[PDB]
Design a protein around this ligand. Structure first.
Ligand SMILES: Nc1nccc(-c2c(-c3ccc(F)cc3)ncn2C2CCNCC2)n1
Ligand SMILES: NS(=O)(=O)c1ccc(N2C(=O)CCC2=O)nc1
Ligand SMILES: NS(=O)(=O)c1ccc(N2C(=O)CCC2=O)nc1
Ligand SMILES: N[C@]1(CO)[C@H]2C[C@@H]3C[C@@H](C[C@H]1C3)C2
Ligand SMILES: [Ca+2]
Ligand SMILES: [Ca+2]
Ligand SMILES: [Ca+2]
Ligand SMILES: [Ca+2]
Ligand SMILES: [Cl-]
Length: 343
């Protein structure tokens, strides 16, 4: 393919003539993103150019990690790869990596910002998040920083999770992540979903804390003071002593917090916004909840193929990560344009 150069976001992009009319649509993880027109299929796409992907072993391994993760994802509610390219003609010149996926116009903040959402619409949005989470969790991939800005949404409210498995808002983070509690499982992401759903229903951030301590206080005012058993998970004595020292707070009745909401929404929120992660509902259990009855379809809530993450434990030299990444670029096989059939 012939490549052309264009200055975008103050740097030179080098892309195949296949992709035209590039225009910037914001930063992404470790890179910046352009919308483009794919002349081969007539589809709109988003192209992410990774920023200095082989600067250090940290950049090199995260480049490999992101390419491995995105090549594995084949789910309608999870960002996956349509293409990956480099202008390099050999490993010796290999220095830039571009990732291509379907174009999604907005993030979830652009859906809820200037719109009073209906309950049926909130159901659809949360249903999609949970469907994608069931899929990535089934491959032992956790998001760990799920938030509205990491939920890509198109013009028809179709949603995909992005930047999974990889100063930022902490308002949606699971408390065990934000506070570095010694144990955490895949339901960290379910706390985030609760936080997002609450905001879709009320138009207000649920836990808008100014710092870690302030946010924990807002959290404990909703869910109540924890039992001694959850202190088991907290390494620092100073943090444990602090929590133990706060005046006892009862759990609030969520029906008095989400006034006038679908009682089924309140019930689901009660199951998700639980301080102890071992008591939280899973994404797969949440999909069977009556709140989603009009959308739930067991035949269309698939799990993932096994995902080999053994590379995560390994320290390799920068040129080995670079070569492994080049291998994954060269071996990529684009999906068919149409991968779905009528039910
Ligand atoms: N507009 C749009 N459409 C799809 C994805 C993205 C995208 C990607 C991304 C990831 C992988 C890839 F291969 C290509 C692009 N990373 C961050 N974003 C965000 C850019 C602005 N915030 C919302 C989405 N942006
Ligand atoms: N925090 S609040 O008192 O501003 C508030 C705002 C909105 C709401 N709400 C509705 O109106 C419909 C569903 C829902 O949850 N509840 C509380
Ligand atoms: N997901 S759940 O519905 O099983 C569940 C489990 C436990 C709890 N909970 C606690 O842990 C302390 C207070 C409280 O209400 N809430 C919901
Ligand atoms: N955001 C709210 C009410 O505005 C604050 C007060 C109380 C506990 C948390 C969650 C709700 C209810 C913080
Ligand atoms: Ca899960
Ligand atoms: Ca269906
Ligand atoms: Ca089809
Ligand atoms: Ca069917
Ligand atoms: Cl694999």
């Amino acid at each position: 393919p012939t490549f052309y150069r264009q200055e975008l976001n103050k740097t030179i992009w080098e892309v195949p003539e296949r992709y035209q009319n590039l225009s910037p649509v914001g930063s992404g993880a470790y890179g910046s993103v352009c919308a483009a027109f794919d002349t081969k299929t007539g589809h709109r796409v988003a192209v992410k150019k990774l920023s200095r992907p082989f600067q250090s072993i940290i950049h090199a391994k995260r480049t490999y990690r992101e390419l491995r993760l995105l090549k594995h994802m084949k789910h309608e509610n999870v960002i996956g790869l349509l293409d990956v390219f480099t202008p390099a003609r050999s490993l010796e010149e290999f220095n830039d990596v571009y990732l291509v996926t379907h174009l999604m116009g907005a993030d979830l903040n652009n859906i809820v910002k200037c719109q009073k959402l209906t309950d049926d619409h909130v159901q659809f949005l949360i249903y999609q998040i949970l469907r994608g989470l069931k899929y990535i969790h089934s491959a032992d991939i956790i998001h760990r920083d799920l938030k509205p800005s990491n939920l890509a949404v198109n013009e028809d409210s179709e949603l995909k999770i992005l930047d999974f498995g990889l100063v930022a808002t902490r308002w949606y983070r699971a408390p065990e992540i934000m506070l570095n509690w010694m144990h955490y499982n895949q339901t960290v992401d379910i706390w985030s979903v609760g936080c997002i759903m609450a905001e879709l229903l009320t138009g207000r951030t649920l836990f808008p804390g100014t710092d870690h301590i302030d946010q924990l206080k807002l959290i404990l005012r909703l869910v109540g003071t924890p039992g001694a058993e959850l202190l088991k998970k907290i390494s620092s004595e100073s943090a444990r002593n602090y929590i133990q020292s706060l005046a006892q707070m009862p759990k609030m009745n969520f029906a008095n917090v989400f006034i006038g909401a679908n009682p089924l929404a309140v019930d689901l929120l009660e199951k998700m916004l639980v301080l102890d992660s071992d008591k939280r509902i899973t994404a797969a259990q949440a999909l069977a909840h009556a709140y989603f009855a009009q959308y739930h379809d067991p035949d269309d809530e698939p799990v993932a193929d096994p995902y080999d993450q053994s590379f995560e434990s390994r320290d390799l030299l920068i040129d080995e990560w670079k070569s492994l990444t080049y291998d994954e670029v060269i071996s990529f096989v684009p999906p068919p344009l149409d991968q779905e059939e009528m039910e």
